[PDB]
Protein backbone atom coordinates (compact mmCIF):
# COMPACT_ATOMS: atom_id res chain seq x y z
CA UNK A 536 0.00 0.00 0.00
CA UNK A 537 0.83 3.69 0.22
CA UNK A 538 1.24 4.56 3.91
CA UNK A 539 0.27 8.14 4.84
CA UNK A 540 1.77 9.52 8.08
CA UNK A 541 0.74 13.05 8.84
CA UNK A 542 2.38 14.58 11.82
CA UNK A 543 1.32 12.11 14.54
CA UNK A 544 -0.16 14.48 17.06
CA UNK A 545 -3.76 15.25 17.89
CA UNK A 546 -3.09 18.87 16.87
CA UNK A 547 -1.92 17.65 13.41
CA UNK A 548 -4.19 17.88 10.40
CA UNK A 549 -4.74 14.78 8.42
CA UNK A 550 -6.94 16.11 5.68
CA UNK A 551 -4.34 17.50 3.21
CA UNK A 552 -2.48 14.16 3.10
CA UNK A 553 -5.85 12.31 2.89
CA UNK A 554 -6.84 14.35 -0.11
CA UNK A 555 -3.50 13.46 -1.78
CA UNK A 556 -4.29 9.83 -0.87
CA UNK A 557 -7.76 10.05 -2.46
CA UNK A 558 -6.14 11.20 -5.69
CA UNK A 559 -3.69 8.27 -5.57
CA UNK A 560 -6.61 5.86 -5.04
CA UNK A 561 -8.26 7.39 -8.23
CA UNK A 562 -5.11 6.26 -10.03
CA UNK A 563 -5.45 2.72 -8.56
CA UNK A 564 -3.10 2.87 -5.49
CA UNK A 565 -4.17 1.65 -2.05
CA UNK A 566 -3.76 4.14 0.77
CA UNK A 567 -3.57 3.58 4.54
CA UNK A 568 -3.80 6.37 7.04
CA UNK A 569 -1.37 5.93 9.89
CA UNK A 570 -2.20 7.77 13.12
CA UNK A 571 -1.51 7.43 16.81
CA UNK A 572 -3.46 4.92 18.92
CA UNK A 573 -4.88 7.87 20.80
CA UNK A 574 -6.10 9.59 17.65
CA UNK A 575 -7.45 6.29 16.20
CA UNK A 576 -9.64 5.64 19.29
CA UNK A 577 -10.88 9.24 19.54
CA UNK A 578 -11.76 10.11 15.90
CA UNK A 579 -13.84 8.43 13.15
CA UNK A 580 -11.85 6.55 10.50
CA UNK A 581 -11.65 8.17 7.04
CA UNK A 582 -13.59 5.45 5.29
CA UNK A 583 -13.17 4.09 1.79
CA UNK A 584 -10.75 4.09 -0.01
CA UNK A 585 -8.55 4.10 3.11
CA UNK A 586 -7.31 1.47 5.51
CA UNK A 587 -6.18 2.68 8.97
CA UNK A 588 -3.24 1.69 11.07
CA UNK A 589 -1.64 2.94 14.22
CA UNK A 590 1.60 3.82 15.88
CA UNK A 591 2.11 5.04 19.45
CA UNK A 592 3.50 8.28 20.75
CA UNK A 593 3.75 7.01 24.39
CA UNK A 594 0.16 7.80 25.29
CA UNK A 595 -2.46 5.52 23.88
CA UNK A 596 -5.22 6.46 26.37
CA UNK A 597 -4.61 10.16 27.03
CA UNK A 598 -3.29 13.09 24.97
CA UNK A 599 0.55 13.06 24.97
CA UNK A 600 0.68 16.83 24.49
CA UNK A 601 -1.47 17.53 27.55
CA UNK A 602 0.68 15.07 29.55
CA UNK A 603 3.93 16.57 28.15
CA UNK A 604 3.47 20.30 27.53
CA UNK A 605 7.23 21.07 27.12
CA UNK A 606 7.58 20.77 23.31
CA UNK A 607 11.02 19.31 23.32
CA UNK A 608 9.99 16.58 25.72
CA UNK A 609 6.81 15.73 23.76
CA UNK A 610 8.90 15.45 20.51
CA UNK A 611 11.60 13.27 22.00
CA UNK A 612 8.90 10.95 23.48
CA UNK A 613 7.08 10.80 20.11
CA UNK A 614 10.33 9.97 18.35
CA UNK A 615 11.22 7.18 20.76
CA UNK A 616 7.79 5.47 20.77
CA UNK A 617 6.84 6.43 17.20
CA UNK A 618 10.02 5.12 15.62
CA UNK A 619 9.68 1.79 17.53
CA UNK A 620 6.03 1.32 16.69
CA UNK A 621 6.44 2.48 13.07
CA UNK A 622 9.12 -0.18 12.58
CA UNK A 623 6.76 -2.72 14.09
CA UNK A 624 4.00 -1.57 11.75
CA UNK A 625 6.16 -1.88 8.61
CA UNK A 626 6.89 -5.51 9.66
CA UNK A 627 3.33 -6.37 10.56
CA UNK A 628 2.09 -4.92 7.23
CA UNK A 629 4.58 -7.01 5.31
CA UNK A 630 3.62 -10.18 7.32
CA UNK A 631 -0.11 -9.42 6.61
CA UNK A 632 0.77 -9.55 2.84
CA UNK A 633 0.60 -5.72 2.49
CA UNK A 634 4.27 -4.66 2.29
CA UNK A 635 4.43 -0.90 2.00
CA UNK A 636 5.33 0.41 -1.42
CA UNK A 637 6.02 3.95 -0.12
CA UNK A 638 5.67 5.99 3.02
CA UNK A 639 4.35 9.50 2.59
CA UNK A 640 5.31 11.39 5.76
CA UNK A 641 5.37 14.97 7.16
CA UNK A 642 9.06 15.64 7.89
CA UNK A 643 8.06 17.55 10.99
CA UNK A 644 8.67 13.78 12.08
CA UNK A 645 12.02 13.07 10.38
CA UNK A 646 12.65 9.79 12.28
CA UNK A 647 9.95 8.28 10.00
CA UNK A 648 12.26 8.47 6.99
CA UNK A 649 15.08 6.69 8.83
CA UNK A 650 12.75 3.92 9.95
CA UNK A 651 11.20 3.38 6.52
CA UNK A 652 14.55 3.53 4.64
CA UNK A 653 15.90 0.87 7.11
CA UNK A 654 12.81 -1.32 6.25
CA UNK A 655 13.55 -0.90 2.54
CA UNK A 656 10.40 1.18 2.00
CA UNK A 657 10.51 4.16 -0.37
CA UNK A 658 9.90 7.56 1.22
CA UNK A 659 8.15 10.74 0.09
CA UNK A 660 8.30 13.84 2.27
CA UNK A 661 5.02 15.85 2.37
CA UNK A 662 5.75 19.48 3.25
CA UNK A 663 2.75 21.01 4.80
CA UNK A 664 3.85 24.72 4.83
CA UNK A 665 4.41 27.24 2.00
CA UNK A 666 7.51 27.12 -0.21
CA UNK A 667 8.56 30.57 1.02
CA UNK A 668 8.89 29.39 4.60
CA UNK A 669 10.16 25.95 3.68
CA UNK A 670 13.08 27.36 1.62
CA UNK A 671 14.24 29.62 4.51
CA UNK A 672 14.38 26.61 6.85
CA UNK A 673 16.20 24.64 4.12
CA UNK A 674 18.86 27.33 3.71
CA UNK A 675 19.63 27.05 7.45
CA UNK A 676 19.66 23.26 7.30
CA UNK A 677 22.08 23.37 4.32
CA UNK A 678 24.36 25.77 6.33
CA UNK A 679 23.98 28.56 3.77
CA UNK A 680 22.42 30.85 6.43
CA UNK A 681 23.45 31.10 10.05
CA UNK A 682 21.03 31.52 12.96
CA UNK A 683 19.39 33.83 13.52
CA UNK A 684 17.99 34.57 10.10
CA UNK A 685 17.73 38.32 9.48
CA UNK A 686 15.92 40.64 7.18
CA UNK A 687 19.29 41.18 5.50
CA UNK A 688 19.41 37.42 4.65
CA UNK A 689 15.82 37.67 3.37
CA UNK A 690 16.66 40.67 1.23
CA UNK A 691 19.42 38.61 -0.34
CA UNK A 692 17.04 35.92 -1.29
CA UNK A 693 14.62 38.48 -2.81
CA UNK A 694 17.52 40.07 -4.69
CA UNK A 695 18.55 36.65 -6.06
CA UNK A 696 15.02 35.94 -7.30
CA UNK A 697 14.26 33.19 -4.80
CA UNK A 698 11.71 35.03 -2.65
CA UNK A 699 9.14 37.09 -4.40
CA UNK A 700 8.70 39.57 -1.53
CA UNK A 701 11.09 41.45 0.76
CA UNK A 702 10.57 40.25 4.28
CA UNK A 703 11.04 42.63 7.17
CA UNK A 704 11.44 41.89 10.84
CA UNK A 705 7.83 41.10 11.43
CA UNK A 706 7.68 38.91 8.32
CA UNK A 707 10.68 36.57 8.67
CA UNK A 708 9.78 33.10 10.22
CA UNK A 709 10.21 33.62 14.01
CA UNK A 710 11.34 29.99 14.66
CA UNK A 711 14.56 30.94 12.84
CA UNK A 712 14.57 34.76 13.25
CA UNK A 713 14.05 34.51 17.07
CA UNK A 714 15.06 31.01 17.79
CA UNK A 715 15.70 31.54 21.49
CA UNK A 716 11.98 31.96 22.00
CA UNK A 717 11.14 28.45 20.78
CA UNK A 718 14.17 26.19 20.81
CA UNK A 719 12.42 22.98 20.08
CA UNK A 720 10.37 24.51 17.21
CA UNK A 721 13.57 25.98 15.69
CA UNK A 722 15.13 22.50 15.72
CA UNK A 723 11.98 20.87 14.34
CA UNK A 724 11.84 23.40 11.52
CA UNK A 725 15.40 22.90 10.41
CA UNK A 726 15.66 19.13 10.90
CA UNK A 727 12.74 18.68 8.46
CA UNK A 728 15.41 19.11 5.81
CA UNK A 729 18.19 17.00 7.38
CA UNK A 730 18.56 14.08 5.06
CA UNK A 731 15.72 15.08 2.79
CA UNK A 732 18.02 14.48 -0.15
CA UNK A 733 17.79 10.73 0.59
CA UNK A 734 14.08 10.65 -0.05
CA UNK A 735 12.68 9.16 -3.25
CA UNK A 736 10.23 12.06 -3.65
CA UNK A 737 9.60 15.43 -2.02
CA UNK A 738 6.07 16.95 -2.24
CA UNK A 739 4.68 20.31 -1.08
CA UNK A 740 1.04 21.39 -0.47
CA UNK A 741 1.16 24.52 -2.61
CA UNK A 742 0.76 25.48 -6.24
CA UNK A 743 3.34 27.03 -8.53
CA UNK A 744 1.37 29.98 -9.67
CA UNK A 745 0.88 31.23 -6.10
CA UNK A 746 4.59 31.23 -5.19
CA UNK A 747 6.37 30.90 -8.53
CA UNK A 748 9.94 31.90 -7.57
CA UNK A 749 9.76 29.95 -4.33
CA UNK A 750 8.31 26.83 -5.86
CA UNK A 751 10.90 26.97 -8.63
CA UNK A 752 13.74 27.21 -6.08
CA UNK A 753 12.25 24.40 -3.96
CA UNK A 754 12.09 22.21 -7.05
CA UNK A 755 15.66 22.82 -8.15
CA UNK A 756 17.13 22.71 -4.63
CA UNK A 757 15.10 20.00 -2.87
CA UNK A 758 13.26 18.19 -5.76
CA UNK A 759 10.03 19.47 -4.23
CA UNK A 760 6.95 19.00 -6.41
CA UNK A 761 3.82 21.02 -5.82
CA UNK A 762 0.70 18.85 -5.27
CA UNK A 763 -1.79 21.36 -3.96
CA UNK A 764 -3.96 22.86 -2.79
CA UNK A 765 -4.71 19.39 -1.38
CA UNK A 766 -8.45 19.96 -0.77
CA UNK A 767 -11.63 18.12 -1.72
CA UNK A 768 -12.23 17.90 -5.47
CA UNK A 769 -15.63 19.61 -5.10
CA UNK A 770 -14.02 22.91 -3.98
CA UNK A 771 -11.53 22.74 -6.86
CA UNK A 772 -14.35 22.34 -9.43
CA UNK A 773 -12.86 18.95 -10.51
CA UNK A 774 -15.50 16.49 -11.74
CA UNK A 775 -13.31 13.30 -12.14
CA UNK A 776 -18.09 21.86 -11.80
CA UNK A 777 -21.17 23.84 -13.28
CA UNK A 778 -23.18 26.46 -11.04
CA UNK A 779 -22.03 27.61 -7.47
CA UNK A 780 -24.14 26.70 -4.48
CA UNK A 781 -22.47 23.95 -2.35
CA UNK A 782 -23.80 20.43 -3.40
CA UNK A 783 -21.81 19.18 -0.30
CA UNK A 784 -24.27 20.60 2.13
CA UNK A 785 -24.36 19.73 5.74
CA UNK A 786 -26.91 20.08 8.54
CA UNK A 787 -24.60 21.97 10.88
CA UNK A 788 -26.58 24.69 12.76
CA UNK A 789 -24.07 27.47 12.06
CA UNK A 790 -24.73 26.89 8.34
CA UNK A 791 -28.44 27.55 8.91
CA UNK A 792 -27.48 30.86 10.57
CA UNK A 793 -25.27 31.74 7.57
CA UNK A 794 -28.11 30.96 5.19
CA UNK A 795 -30.15 33.83 6.74
CA UNK A 796 -27.38 36.47 6.23
CA UNK A 797 -27.03 38.66 3.17
CA UNK A 798 -24.50 37.90 0.43
CA UNK A 799 -20.86 38.70 1.30
CA UNK A 800 -21.87 40.13 4.63
CA UNK A 801 -20.29 37.82 7.20
CA UNK A 802 -16.86 37.89 8.77
CA UNK A 803 -15.54 34.39 9.66
CA UNK A 804 -13.15 34.57 12.61
CA UNK A 805 -10.72 31.88 13.71
CA UNK A 806 -7.26 31.69 15.24
CA UNK A 807 -6.95 28.05 14.49
CA UNK A 808 -6.78 24.88 16.55
CA UNK A 809 -3.53 25.30 18.49
CA UNK A 810 -2.94 28.91 19.55
CA UNK A 811 -4.30 30.10 22.88
CA UNK A 812 -5.55 33.61 23.55
CA UNK A 813 -5.66 35.07 27.04
CA UNK A 814 -8.75 36.81 28.43
CA UNK A 815 -7.41 40.29 27.44
CA UNK A 816 -6.76 39.16 23.85
CA UNK A 817 -10.19 37.60 23.52
CA UNK A 818 -11.73 40.79 24.81
CA UNK A 819 -9.97 42.95 22.21
CA UNK A 820 -10.86 40.53 19.42
CA UNK A 821 -14.51 40.07 20.35
CA UNK A 822 -15.10 43.78 21.01
CA UNK A 823 -13.47 44.63 17.66
CA UNK A 824 -15.92 42.25 15.99
CA UNK A 825 -18.90 43.74 17.71
CA UNK A 826 -17.67 47.29 17.07
CA UNK A 827 -17.45 46.57 13.32
CA UNK A 828 -21.19 46.26 12.96
CA UNK A 829 -20.85 43.23 10.64
CA UNK A 830 -22.39 39.91 11.11
CA UNK A 831 -19.74 37.42 12.22
CA UNK A 832 -19.14 33.74 12.87
CA UNK A 833 -16.55 33.50 15.67
CA UNK A 834 -14.87 30.16 16.34
CA UNK A 835 -13.92 29.97 20.04
CA UNK A 836 -12.81 26.42 20.82
CA UNK A 837 -14.30 24.45 23.68
CA UNK A 838 -10.96 24.56 25.48
CA UNK A 839 -10.80 28.40 25.20
CA UNK A 840 -14.41 29.41 25.83
CA UNK A 841 -14.01 29.61 29.66
CA UNK A 842 -12.11 32.82 28.96
CA UNK A 843 -15.15 34.50 27.31
CA UNK A 844 -17.12 36.64 29.73
CA UNK A 845 -20.85 36.61 29.98
CA UNK A 846 -21.05 40.24 28.97
CA UNK A 847 -18.96 39.73 25.79
CA UNK A 848 -20.88 36.71 24.78
CA UNK A 849 -24.07 38.72 25.17
CA UNK A 850 -22.66 41.60 23.16
CA UNK A 851 -21.88 39.11 20.37
CA UNK A 852 -25.56 38.01 20.27
CA UNK A 853 -26.67 41.13 18.48
CA UNK A 854 -25.07 40.25 15.15
CA UNK A 855 -22.70 37.39 15.79
CA UNK A 856 -22.66 33.63 16.39
CA UNK A 857 -20.02 31.94 18.56
CA UNK A 858 -19.27 28.25 17.88
CA UNK A 859 -16.61 25.78 19.07
CA UNK A 860 -15.88 24.43 15.65
CA UNK A 861 -17.29 25.08 12.22
CA UNK A 862 -17.12 23.24 8.78
CA UNK A 863 -14.66 25.82 7.65
CA UNK A 864 -14.57 24.84 3.98
CA UNK A 865 -18.34 24.92 3.81
CA UNK A 866 -18.37 28.31 5.52
CA UNK A 867 -15.82 29.77 3.21
CA UNK A 868 -17.74 28.53 0.13
CA UNK A 869 -20.95 30.09 1.42
CA UNK A 870 -22.45 33.03 -0.42
CA UNK A 871 -22.92 34.95 2.84
CA UNK A 872 -19.18 34.93 3.62
CA UNK A 873 -17.52 38.28 3.00
CA UNK A 874 -14.08 37.95 4.59
CA UNK A 875 -12.02 35.77 6.90
CA UNK A 876 -10.17 37.16 9.94
CA UNK A 877 -7.62 34.37 10.25
CA UNK A 878 -4.32 33.67 11.98
CA UNK A 879 -3.12 32.69 8.46
CA UNK A 880 -2.24 29.14 9.25
CA UNK A 881 -1.42 27.59 5.85
CA UNK A 882 -4.41 25.28 5.68
CA UNK A 883 -6.78 28.17 6.47
CA UNK A 884 -5.02 30.36 3.91
CA UNK A 885 -5.28 27.76 1.15
CA UNK A 886 -9.01 27.29 2.01
CA UNK A 887 -9.54 31.02 1.74
CA UNK A 888 -7.73 31.11 -1.64
CA UNK A 889 -9.72 28.22 -3.14
CA UNK A 890 -12.94 29.98 -2.17
CA UNK A 891 -11.87 33.49 -3.24
CA UNK A 892 -12.28 35.01 0.23
CA UNK A 893 -10.37 38.10 1.24
CA UNK A 894 -8.34 37.94 4.42
CA UNK A 895 -7.66 39.99 7.55
CA UNK A 896 -4.43 38.45 8.80
CA UNK A 897 -3.71 38.11 12.54
CA UNK A 898 -0.58 35.92 12.63
CA UNK A 899 1.06 34.46 15.75
CA UNK A 900 4.14 32.39 14.75
CA UNK A 901 5.44 29.44 12.64
CA UNK A 902 4.60 30.18 9.01
CA UNK A 903 2.00 32.80 9.78
CA UNK A 904 3.95 36.04 9.80
CA UNK A 905 5.42 35.13 6.42
CA UNK A 906 2.13 34.08 4.92
CA UNK A 907 0.54 37.33 6.23
CA UNK A 908 3.18 39.38 4.39
CA UNK A 909 2.46 37.51 1.09
CA UNK A 910 -1.29 38.14 1.68
CA UNK A 911 -0.82 41.83 1.99
CA UNK A 912 2.04 42.50 -0.41
CA UNK A 913 2.38 39.98 -3.21
CA UNK A 914 -1.03 38.33 -3.43
CA UNK A 915 -2.90 41.45 -2.48
CA UNK A 916 -5.87 39.58 -1.11
CA UNK A 917 -6.16 41.33 2.24
CA UNK A 918 -4.60 43.24 5.07
CA UNK A 919 -2.54 42.48 8.17
CA UNK A 920 -3.49 43.78 11.61
CA UNK A 921 -1.00 46.31 13.01
CA UNK A 922 0.05 45.81 16.61
CA UNK A 923 0.75 48.82 18.93
CA UNK A 924 4.17 49.71 20.36
CA UNK A 925 3.88 47.02 23.08
CA UNK A 926 2.84 44.27 20.68
CA UNK A 927 -0.86 44.37 21.70
CA UNK A 928 -3.68 44.05 19.21
CA UNK A 929 -6.25 46.68 19.98
CA UNK A 930 -10.00 46.46 19.37
CA UNK A 931 -9.77 49.60 17.28
CA UNK A 932 -7.32 47.86 14.92
CA UNK A 933 -9.45 44.72 14.59
CA UNK A 934 -12.38 46.91 13.68
CA UNK A 935 -10.39 49.12 11.29
CA UNK A 936 -9.10 46.08 9.32
CA UNK A 937 -12.51 44.50 9.02
CA UNK A 938 -13.94 47.71 7.76
CA UNK A 939 -10.93 48.19 5.40
CA UNK A 940 -11.52 44.88 3.65
CA UNK A 941 -15.30 45.04 3.58
CA UNK A 942 -15.84 48.77 2.95
CA UNK A 943 -12.57 50.50 2.21
CA UNK A 944 -11.47 52.29 -0.96
CA UNK A 945 -9.48 49.16 -1.86
CA UNK A 946 -12.25 46.63 -1.15
CA UNK A 947 -12.40 45.68 -4.78
CA UNK A 948 -8.58 45.18 -4.95
CA UNK A 949 -8.69 42.50 -2.28
CA UNK A 950 -11.65 40.73 -3.87
CA UNK A 951 -10.07 40.93 -7.32
CA UNK A 952 -6.87 39.29 -6.11
CA UNK A 953 -8.72 36.63 -4.11
CA UNK A 954 -10.82 35.71 -7.19
CA UNK A 955 -7.75 35.68 -9.44
CA UNK A 956 -5.85 33.26 -7.17
CA UNK A 957 -8.99 31.11 -6.69
CA UNK A 958 -9.05 30.50 -10.44
CA UNK A 959 -5.38 29.64 -10.60
CA UNK A 960 -5.68 27.25 -7.63
CA UNK A 961 -8.49 25.41 -9.40
CA UNK A 962 -6.55 25.29 -12.65
CA UNK A 963 -3.55 23.79 -10.89
CA UNK A 964 -5.52 20.82 -9.58
CA UNK A 965 -7.67 20.15 -12.66
CA UNK A 966 -6.48 17.77 -15.27
CA UNK A 967 -3.30 19.03 -16.93
CA UNK A 968 -2.64 21.58 -14.20
CA UNK A 969 0.72 22.04 -12.62
CA UNK A 970 -0.13 20.22 -9.38
CA UNK A 971 -2.28 17.51 -11.00
CA UNK A 972 0.71 16.64 -13.22
CA UNK A 973 2.92 16.01 -10.24
CA UNK A 974 0.26 13.84 -8.53
CA UNK A 975 -0.07 11.77 -11.72
CA UNK A 976 3.70 11.34 -11.97
CA UNK A 977 3.87 10.10 -8.39
CA UNK A 978 1.00 7.73 -8.84
CA UNK A 979 2.63 6.18 -11.93
CA UNK A 980 5.91 5.82 -10.13
CA UNK A 981 4.34 3.69 -7.37
CA UNK A 982 1.94 1.62 -9.48
Ligand SMILES: O=c1ccn([C@@H]2O[C@H](COP(=O)(O)OP(=O)(O)O)[C@@H](O)[C@H]2O)c(=O)[nH]1
Nearest residue numbers: 807808809834860861863864880881882883
Ligand atom coordinates in the same frame (compact mmCIF):
# COMPACT_ATOMS: atom_id res chain seq x y z
O1 LIG B 1 -13.57 25.60 13.32
C1 LIG B 1 -12.64 25.15 12.62
C2 LIG B 1 -11.29 25.51 12.83
C3 LIG B 1 -10.40 24.94 11.96
N1 LIG B 1 -10.73 24.02 11.00
C4 LIG B 1 -9.78 23.41 10.07
O2 LIG B 1 -8.57 23.28 10.84
C5 LIG B 1 -7.40 23.47 10.01
C6 LIG B 1 -6.58 24.55 10.72
O3 LIG B 1 -5.26 24.56 10.11
P1 LIG B 1 -4.35 25.81 10.01
O4 LIG B 1 -3.10 25.43 9.27
O5 LIG B 1 -5.01 26.95 9.44
O6 LIG B 1 -3.85 26.26 11.48
P2 LIG B 1 -3.65 25.55 12.91
O7 LIG B 1 -4.98 25.28 13.42
O8 LIG B 1 -2.74 24.36 12.63
O9 LIG B 1 -2.89 26.60 13.55
C7 LIG B 1 -7.98 23.92 8.67
O10 LIG B 1 -8.03 22.81 7.74
C8 LIG B 1 -9.41 24.40 9.01
O11 LIG B 1 -10.36 24.37 7.87
C9 LIG B 1 -12.07 23.71 10.84
O12 LIG B 1 -12.42 22.91 9.99
N2 LIG B 1 -12.96 24.25 11.68
